[PDB]
Amino acid sequence: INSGDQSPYRYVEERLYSKPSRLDREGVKVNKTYALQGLGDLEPLRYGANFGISEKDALKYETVAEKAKYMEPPIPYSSLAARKLAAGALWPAAPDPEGMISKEVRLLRHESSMSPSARAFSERVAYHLRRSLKACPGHIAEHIDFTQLIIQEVLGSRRSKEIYIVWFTVDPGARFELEPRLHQLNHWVQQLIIKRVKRRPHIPRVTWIYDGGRLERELPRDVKQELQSFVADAATTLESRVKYLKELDTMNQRMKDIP
Amino acid sequence: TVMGKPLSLVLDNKAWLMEMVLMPFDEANLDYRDFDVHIVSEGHAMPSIANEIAAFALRMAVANALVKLIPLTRIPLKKSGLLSVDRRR
Amino acid sequence: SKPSDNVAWYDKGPVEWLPRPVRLTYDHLDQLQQWMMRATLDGRTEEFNRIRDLHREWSQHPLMPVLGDVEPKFPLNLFKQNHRAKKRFLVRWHKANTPANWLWMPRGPTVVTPLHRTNPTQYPENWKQMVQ
Amino acid sequence: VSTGEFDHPPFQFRQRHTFNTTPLHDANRFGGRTAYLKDPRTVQFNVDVWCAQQTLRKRWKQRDWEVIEIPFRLVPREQQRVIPELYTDIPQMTDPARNDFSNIRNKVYDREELQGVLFPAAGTMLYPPLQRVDKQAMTLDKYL
Amino acid sequence: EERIRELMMPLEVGENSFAANGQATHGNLFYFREYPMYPGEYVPAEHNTLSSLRD
Amino acid sequence: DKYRRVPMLLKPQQGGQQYFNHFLIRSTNDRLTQQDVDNVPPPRVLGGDYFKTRFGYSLVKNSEMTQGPVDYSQLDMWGEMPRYTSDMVFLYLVSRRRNTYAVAYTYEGKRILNTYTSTDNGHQVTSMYLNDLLPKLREMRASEGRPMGRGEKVELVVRVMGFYNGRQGAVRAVQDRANEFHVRYFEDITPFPLNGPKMPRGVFK
Amino acid sequence: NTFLTSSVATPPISVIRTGPKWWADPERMVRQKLMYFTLGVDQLPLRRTAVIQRDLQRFHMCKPPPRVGDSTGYKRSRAAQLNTWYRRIQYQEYHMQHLFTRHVWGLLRVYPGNTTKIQGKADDGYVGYDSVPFHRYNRAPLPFPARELYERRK
Amino acid sequence: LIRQCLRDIVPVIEYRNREEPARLPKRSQAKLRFRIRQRLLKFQRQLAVANAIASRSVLY
Amino acid sequence: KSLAAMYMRPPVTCYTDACEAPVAMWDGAIPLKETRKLKNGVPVRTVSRTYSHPPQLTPTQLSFNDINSMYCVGNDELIQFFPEGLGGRVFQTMPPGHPRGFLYRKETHLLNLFVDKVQHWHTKRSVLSSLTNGRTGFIVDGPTGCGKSALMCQVVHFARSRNIVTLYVPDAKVWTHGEWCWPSTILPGFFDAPDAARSFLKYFAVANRATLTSWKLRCTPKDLPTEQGERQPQNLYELCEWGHRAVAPASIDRQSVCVKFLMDELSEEKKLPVVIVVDGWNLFSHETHFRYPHPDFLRGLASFNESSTDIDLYPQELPRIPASRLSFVRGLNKMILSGDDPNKFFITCTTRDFKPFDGISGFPNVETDRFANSLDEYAPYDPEKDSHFHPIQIGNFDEYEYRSFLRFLINSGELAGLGWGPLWHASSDFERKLYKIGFLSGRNPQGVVDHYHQELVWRYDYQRTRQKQYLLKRRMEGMSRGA
Amino acid sequence: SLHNPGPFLDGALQLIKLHLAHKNAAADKNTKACSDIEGEFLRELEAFRPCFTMSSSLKVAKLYTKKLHGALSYFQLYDDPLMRQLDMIIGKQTMLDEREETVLPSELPNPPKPDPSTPLRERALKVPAQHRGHWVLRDPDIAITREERRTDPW
Amino acid sequence: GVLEGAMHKPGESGLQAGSSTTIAGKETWSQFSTKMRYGRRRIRVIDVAAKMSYEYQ
RNA sequence: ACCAUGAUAAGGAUUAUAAAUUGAAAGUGUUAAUAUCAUAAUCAAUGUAUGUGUAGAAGA
Ligand SMILES: Nc1nc2c(ncn2[C@@H]2O[C@H](COP(=O)(O)OP(=O)(O)OP(=O)(O)O)[C@@H](O)[C@H]2O)c(=O)[nH]1
Numbered sequence A: 001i002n003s004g005d006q007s008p009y010r011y012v013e014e015r016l017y018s019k020p021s022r023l024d025r026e027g028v029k030v031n032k033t034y035a036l037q038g039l040g041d042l043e044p045l046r047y048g049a050n051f052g053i054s055e056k057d058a059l060k061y062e063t064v065a066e067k068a069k070y071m072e073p074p075i076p077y078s079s080l081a082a083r084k085l086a087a088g089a090l091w092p093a094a095p096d097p098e099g100m101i102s103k104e105v106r107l108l109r110h111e112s113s114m115s116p117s118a119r120a121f122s123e124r125v126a127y128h129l130r131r132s133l134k135a136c137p138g139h140i141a142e143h144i145d146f147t148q149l150i151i152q153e154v155l156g157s158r159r160s161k162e163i164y165i166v167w168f169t170v171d172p173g174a175r176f177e178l179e180p181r182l183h184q185l186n187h188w189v190q191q192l193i194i195k196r197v198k199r200r201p202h203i204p205r206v207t208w209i210y211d212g213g214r215l216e217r218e219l220p221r222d223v224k225q226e227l228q229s230f231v232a233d234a235a236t237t238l239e240s241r242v243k244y245l246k247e248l249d250t251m252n253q254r255m256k257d258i259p
Numbered sequence B: 001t002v003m004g005k006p007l008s009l010v011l012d013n014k015a016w017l018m019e020m021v022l023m024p025f026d027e028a029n030l031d032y033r034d035f036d037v038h039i040v041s042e043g044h045a046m047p048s049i050a051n052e053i054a055a056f057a058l059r060m061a062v063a064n065a066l067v068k069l070i071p072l073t074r075i076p077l078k079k080s081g082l083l084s085v086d087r088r089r
Numbered sequence C: 001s002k003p004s005d006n007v008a009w010y011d012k013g014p015v016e017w018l019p020r021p022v023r024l025t026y027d028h029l030d031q032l033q034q035w036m037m038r039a040t041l042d043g044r045t046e047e048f049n050r051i052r053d054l055h056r057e058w059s060q061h062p063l064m065p066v067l068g069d070v071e072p073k074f075p076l077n078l079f080k081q082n083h084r085a086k087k088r089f090l091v092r093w094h095k096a097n098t099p100a101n102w103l104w105m106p107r108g109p110t111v112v113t114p115l116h117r118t119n120p121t122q123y124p125e126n127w128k129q130m131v132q
Numbered sequence D: 001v002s003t004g005e006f007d008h009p010p011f012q013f014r015q016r017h018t019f020n021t022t023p024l025h026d027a028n029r030f031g032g033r034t035a036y037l038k039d040p041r042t043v044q045f046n047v048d049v050w051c052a053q054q055t056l057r058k059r060w061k062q063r064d065w066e067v068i069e070i071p072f073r074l075v076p077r078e079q080q081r082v083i084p085e086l087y088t089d090i091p092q093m094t095d096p097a098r099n100d101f102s103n104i105r106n107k108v109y110d111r112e113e114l115q116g117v118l119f120p121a122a123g124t125m126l127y128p129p130l131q132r133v134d135k136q137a138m139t140l141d142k143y144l
Numbered sequence E: 001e002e003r004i005r006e007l008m009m010p011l012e013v014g015e016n017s018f019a020a021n022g023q024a025t026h027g028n029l030f031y032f033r034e035y036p037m038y039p040g041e042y043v044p045a046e047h048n049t050l051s052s053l054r055d
Numbered sequence F: 001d002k003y004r005r006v007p008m009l010l011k012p013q014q015g016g017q018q019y020f021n022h023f024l025i026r027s028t029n030d031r032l033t034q035q036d037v038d039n040v041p042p043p044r045v046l047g048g049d050y051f052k053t054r055f056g057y058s059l060v061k062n063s064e065m066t067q068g069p070v071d072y073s074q075l076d077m078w079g080e081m082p083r084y085t086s087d088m089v090f091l092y093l094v095s096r097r098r099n100t101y102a103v104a105y106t107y108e109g110k111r112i113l114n115t116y117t118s119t120d121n122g123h124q125v126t127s128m129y130l131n132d133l134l135p136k137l138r139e140m141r142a143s144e145g146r147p148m149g150r151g152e153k154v155e156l157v158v159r160v161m162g163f164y165n166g167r168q169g170a171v172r173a174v175q176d177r178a179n180e181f182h183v184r185y186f187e188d189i190t191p192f193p194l195n196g197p198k199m200p201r202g203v204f205k
Numbered sequence G: 001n002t003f004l005t006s007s008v009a010t011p012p013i014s015v016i017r018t019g020p021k022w023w024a025d026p027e028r029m030v031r032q033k034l035m036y037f038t039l040g041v042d043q044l045p046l047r048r049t050a051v052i053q054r055d056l057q058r059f060h061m062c063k064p065p066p067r068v069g070d071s072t073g074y075k076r077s078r079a080a081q082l083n084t085w086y087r088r089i090q091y092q093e094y095h096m097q098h099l100f101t102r103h104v105w106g107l108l109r110v111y112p113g114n115t116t117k118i119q120g121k122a123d124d125g126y127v128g129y130d131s132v133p134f135h136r137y138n139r140a141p142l143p144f145p146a147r148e149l150y151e152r153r154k
Numbered sequence H: 001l002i003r004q005c006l007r008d009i010v011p012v013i014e015y016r017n018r019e020e021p022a023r024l025p026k027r028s029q030a031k032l033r034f035r036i037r038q039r040l041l042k043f044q045r046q047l048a049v050a051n052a053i054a055s056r057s058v059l060y
Numbered sequence I: 001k002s003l004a005a006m007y008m009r010p011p012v013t014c015y016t017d018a019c020e021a022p023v024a025m026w027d028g029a030i031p032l033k034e035t036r037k038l039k040n041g042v043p044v045r046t047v048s049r050t051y052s053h054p055p056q057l058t059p060t061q062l063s064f065n066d067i068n069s070m071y072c073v074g075n076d077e078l079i080q081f082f083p084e085g086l087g088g089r090v091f092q093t094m095p096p097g098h099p100r101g102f103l104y105r106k107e108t109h110l111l112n113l114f115v116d117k118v119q120h121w122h123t124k125r126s127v128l129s130s131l132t133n134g135r136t137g138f139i140v141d142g143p144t145g146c147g148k149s150a151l152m153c154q155v156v157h158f159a160r161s162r163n164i165v166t167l168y169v170p171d172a173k174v175w176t177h178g179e180w181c182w183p184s185t186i187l188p189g190f191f192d193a194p195d196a197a198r199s200f201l202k203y204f205a206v207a208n209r210a211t212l213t214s215w216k217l218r219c220t221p222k223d224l225p226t227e228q229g230e231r232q233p234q235n236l237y238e239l240c241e242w243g244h245r246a247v248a249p250a251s252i253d254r255q256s257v258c259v260k261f262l263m264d265e266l267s268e269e270k271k272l273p274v275v276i277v278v279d280g281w282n283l284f285s286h287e288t289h290f291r292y293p294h295p296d297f298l299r300g301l302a303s304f305n306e307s308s309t310d311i312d313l314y315p316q317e318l319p320r321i322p323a324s325r326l327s328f329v330r331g332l333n334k335m336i337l338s339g340d341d342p343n344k345f346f347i348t349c350t351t352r353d354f355k356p357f358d359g360i361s362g363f364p365n366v367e368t369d370r371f372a373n374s375l376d377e378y379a380p381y382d383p384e385k386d387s388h389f390h391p392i393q394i395g396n397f398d399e400y401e402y403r404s405f406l407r408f409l410i411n412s413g414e415l416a417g418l419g420w421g422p423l424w425h426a427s428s429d430f431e432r433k434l435y436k437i438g439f440l441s442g443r444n445p446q447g448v449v450d451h452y453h454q455e456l457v458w459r460y461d462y463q464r465t466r467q468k469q470y471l472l473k474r475r476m477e478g479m480s481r482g483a
Numbered sequence J: 001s002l003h004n005p006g007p008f009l010d011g012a013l014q015l016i017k018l019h020l021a022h023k024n025a026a027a028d029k030n031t032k033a034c035s036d037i038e039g040e041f042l043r044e045l046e047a048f049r050p051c052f053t054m055s056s057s058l059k060v061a062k063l064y065t066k067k068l069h070g071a072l073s074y075f076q077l078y079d080d081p082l083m084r085q086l087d088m089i090i091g092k093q094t095m096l097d098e099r100e101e102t103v104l105p106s107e108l109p110n111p112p113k114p115d116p117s118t119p120l121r122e123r124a125l126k127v128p129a130q131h132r133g134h135w136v137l138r139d140p141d142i143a144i145t146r147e148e149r150r151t152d153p154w
Numbered sequence K: 001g002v003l004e005g006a007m008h009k010p011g012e013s014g015l016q017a018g019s020s021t022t023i024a025g026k027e028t029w030s031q032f033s034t035k036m037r038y039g040r041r042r043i044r045v046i047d048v049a050a051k052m053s054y055e056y057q
Numbered sequence L: 001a002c003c004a005u006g007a008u009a010a011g012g013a014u015u016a017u018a019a020a021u022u023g024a025a026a027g028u029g030u031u032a033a034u035a036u037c038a039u040a041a042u043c044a045a046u047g048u049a050u051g052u053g054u055a056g057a058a059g060a
């Protein structure tokens, strides 16, 4: 495939799974985006002929409820469906387990790199986790060796969709005794969050990060911005910003010109 | 012998250069002592050719000569890439 | 003189950090060969023992880093087209990170090394003590 | 083949004394004779003159003989021929008939062999007769 | 010597053993074939198959 | 690309083609050889004197005979719990976000030394506490009537609280003094929460 | 030694980025191995550097495939870990080269370049006949002639 | 910080001086109207900044 | 496979056995075999090294069957027999802690037997005369790095272990191509090399203390100048000590007298066999690079513009002083050409360490120059015409000697702990190394040593890569079968 | 938090040492020496008054206040701003058991009781004996403070 | 982390980064920059006799 | 000489089912901003100091 100003992965994603791609495949004249031709048995079964349901027909319904009301059942089986069944491609192969190992991430989010709301929620979560960690369900408590566990902090995302509990052990040899038991608690932790902290942007997904002092933090937001302003190329930045202003004023003139 | 002088003297007794000249024999499962060779240079003459590009050219020449002497040697040599020509200037 | 960032920092280690270019020669090797021959024929082994001590102290196998521990410690992706800024940062970073501070190199009496002899006694210079 | 440097380094910028580079025109490149040094052409010409000087001095130190001009009669049979001047004919073999395939121009005669024609006036052997070892005699080498 | 070193020979990245061959960055870049390439190499045919065909 | 001009057979530049035939033949030979061939509890201890010399504590009671006792014996309230003997020093190391405390108690609950006060904080506090405690243990045992004995290390029960960084440093500090303090039970004291008293608003909202 | 001019330091990373050009130049590595062998000590860091560079040079023309992308990132983390391990072995051998070369120069009574430290002889920078008339860093007047670090007898 | 404020202001004055342009002083339709409203609401601030720069209504 | 912990060191008996290193270094470089014995129980296990160091034997113990075999000499014996050193490149292979190996070639055996006869020459005089064809000794010639210096070192070893007076002259360039030349104090028209002379006197005295101490000086004035407290010399050892032990510059003029009288007395002696071994006899034969001083420095001057002398204006080239005019070489030649002295045997060798020249020559860059300490002598040399000794021609190693020498080099280096060691799997096997180094060196000895060192650099050896690949695949399929 | 009472202690101790040396000089009846000591005391007071105000809210400042006030009173400086600040700080300075004793398993052999006689630290919370994490947490100098409670649970 | 070039000792220059590891007698680099800004506030004197008046020329 | 040149950045689809070859590549196809002198009557030019540049080379 030919990729221009975009990655080949994203290019194929757009040309396979997309509104204009699907419309062109169903046979609707669109120009800017095109579907991939002649994929044999490789095109998604959703868009194979004699399967799924026609989007050219589905354009006729203005609402999802109306589509549900008036849209006839899909054809259960097809030739491409038989090929997918023969190849075993009716359900993707299971990837390696990620719910029983820690996140070996690149950086470690800085205390100044998170919104104040996320920061607030984080210290509350850390307080309650440290207070209640011994009152975990008995069938996990009986095997967790609390003598070794340590939790440095909890970081989480902006608006706390995700929480990252940074933990390690006194002796490094205990990480592989402690990790699975710790990952068996990610539901108990969510219930603790629901029960104890009342100002939560929303109940998050819990993820454990092992950092025995090995990982390295990020730079402060202000220091990073100062470094960027200090070393950035002034000529290119000025030209780009002037072009941006030119485009903004052009759009404003178009808006004012349309009566 | 390269241009009337022993290889150890032409390539200035450099192990990493003469082993390329040896490579076509080893890849072919052959004994270098069963064959005696002479390499003549038609390129830009220089006082010393003790460099990797010259060694590459010598290895390619030896490999081609071996191929034409005994055709069945062309199997391991092409697979090893001694018959392939680099295009870099 | 004009102050610069070429400070040698002689305080630490046997070699001044950001060390000056050091170039060896075959004449140096010949002089070393003659010096070693004369020392071996005169029986002086104190300098050999000191050389082995330095080799043992500074020639251990570096510890395999643990995941997450990376080599630059600084993004180095922000100096976009600022090659001189990147070069100054690299000079200063490698000047700060000194061999005395090279934690990942096991060095000191706390280390055990079955590869090299530690006590100058168990060397072939002392071979009549080994004969029961 | 020679491993010594023949060309002068190019000047495209000011170099420094670094790990893999040295200052241009330092007292290390051509034996310290760069202290005399502009134009790459004239600099290369001077370096060529120095290289030719080195070639000449080693070529003359390699020379251990002398070119006494001997009359035709008092001369070995191999040199009793007509010898073309240098670069006039094919490199001449001394005598293919007697299996002596060797450049006649490079032949060197031991001085203790022409005492019969050199120094004909001195009735005493200024140079004692040359001692030649016997090949057909059991010696330490031939004993095993 | 070679037959003993064959069993002493390391196979994991450890102490003085390490995959500097781009296997971590590039992966398996060296081919390795279990079949004799017809004109050059030879391995005797298996006797189970020989007997099957003869029978 | 920078190396677009080099051949694909030189990109990896395969080598050693002369070994493949040998490997195939050797594999077949070893398969034939295999077909032809086809056709942890701990150590043992036996002597009582040896056990005593090896472990530093005699197994046989070797004490006064209190024979002819009652025919039924009462159990301990906590049978399964570890056997804390009289001469064990119980040191508690409590960690927090900003601070770390270390105290040491006698087998009877008597405090030996006052409290002392991140990872480095805990390490230093513990090291200083141990250094100052060893002499205090000397004097307390001497007053009791127990001489140290040359090289006899104090038997220690270390108990840690707080899921904070300082725990690693404090335990490393206790470990660094192994030659004098012999840790026999390392355990945790982080309390099980209950209804408990009210908590600050900042924790909740 | 005959390189007695004031010099410029270079970070070990940029020294090692040369690789086959100068850092791992085979002739230079061979004569470093010869120095170590004559001194009578094992060339283990040197051999680690040699095999590292051989295997890297064996692939330097291969472009890595575009990574599909794994959230766990264990693959990228391991790749970086091994890269940094190799870099650290090369740093160790780099430091060893300088250390033993200065030791040998001190042994053979060879004067180093300006602002070079020899542990036994000149702890601070040795400066002899520099363009700047005073110490480059200590701001003191160097004597005429340059200080003799060693004795006079040959 | 000096370079940051310079890099922030100089584009405005340079555009004003050199790059300033000349001046001469039903459900589907409803959903399209909504999408246009959405884009303009998302980019309200910088469009207002551009119009203010054009109209010279900005407090330095 | 971890048979290292089960390995117990053998009993140390010699310096060679003491050269052994911790098992962690040579585990795998020298794999350990296991031998089961039935001693006081059917099962036993003795983990032993497959390879052991070559034996440390004396020249007397060396035999005919040892030809093309490697032996060793203890460090103490080395220091005893070589105070002056090991001329040439022979000590290149003997760093501190390394065994001091030595090949035993056919020429080495011939020389050992000849020295055996020299030990009692007066009875074997006819045998010696027939062996040398009547010439006063042998001169060893051959290509570069061929082993002439090693053979002379072995000859000196043989003679000094048999307790005969030996005049060993390593690196005859120290004499001919010395540092500075000085006219002889007592020999008019003859020149000296005082530094080399004093060093030679020291080393000769310490080497031959026993015989020199037992010596009695016959023709030597006993009124030699002497400082307070020093006893006048009475034996040749004390003569050498008086010559070389003195304060500068008083040693410069004393060494000339000492060497002149030592040469005179050695020429006089007619009973003790004296073996004279010199490395590079061509240097003593043709010339020394020193030139005669310009006569202006001798005549004397009043003012410079007066005589219009150009000594400081233009350099010149005075005739080179021939090596015959030195006092040491004068004694040697006096003893050589003058008959009636069947008591001194000259086992000399030539040298070929000259700088290379092949038609053109630039300037060798200082940092990368393996001929930096080579000799500026491009003139040819023919031993038969340029010397009175019987010439012996040596060539490069034949496959037998080459295999033995490379086996010793590699295996003993790794055993002593200076080779690949734990990284043995990074290097090919001994057969591949032998084949490749033979190709690269032509079985030349010096080339073999150089390429043994350069083997660190080989980049086109895929044997270990393919071996690891095959063994990993075999193990993986075995585990998959087991599952 | 990388704050060192080094220089503040160094300044204060000099003031106290001069304060003592002044009594000693007056007892020796050396008028010139005591006048010089008084002059130097004023000189050092002027340079010390800024270190005091910057560090007046530190623990180390809380303990030398009365001794420094005694020094100033001995020197008879009663209108000094530092005297007034010392007066203010000194003025501010001057102004649940369980039904049945039970022992947790984590305090098995003999629970360590901080005998009720000893008073717990100034800023600390006296919690019920039932809702104690552990008797060590009710230890007097380990007792949770209010601000420490706001941050960590136990 | 690495505290070998973190702080600036007043004695040394700004580019001559100090090798000292102590903390007490050091000022941070932001403070060094502020001090240099507050210190470089003087003009080199303008030569009066060196250059002649434009009207004179 | 007052013509309607033209540079500048921006849009894109097509092609490996081979393990051969010294080499497994090139064809193909888009919006703005900027710019446009020539059918006419001439004329010798302590306390202390950091640059851009130039030459070689988060797919909200
Ligand atoms: N141990 C040992 N080494 C040998 C022997 N023969 C040659 N060599 C090696 O060869 C190297 C060079 O020494 P020689 O071959 O004797 O040198 P040469 O014969 O004087 O020839 P030139 O170098 O031209 O003067 C030495 O470093 C030895 O290690 C031998 O018989 N035994």
Ligand SMILES: [Mg+2]
Pocket (backbone or CB within 6 Å): I087, I088, I089, I148, I149, I279, I351, I352, I353
């Ligand atoms: Mg020699």
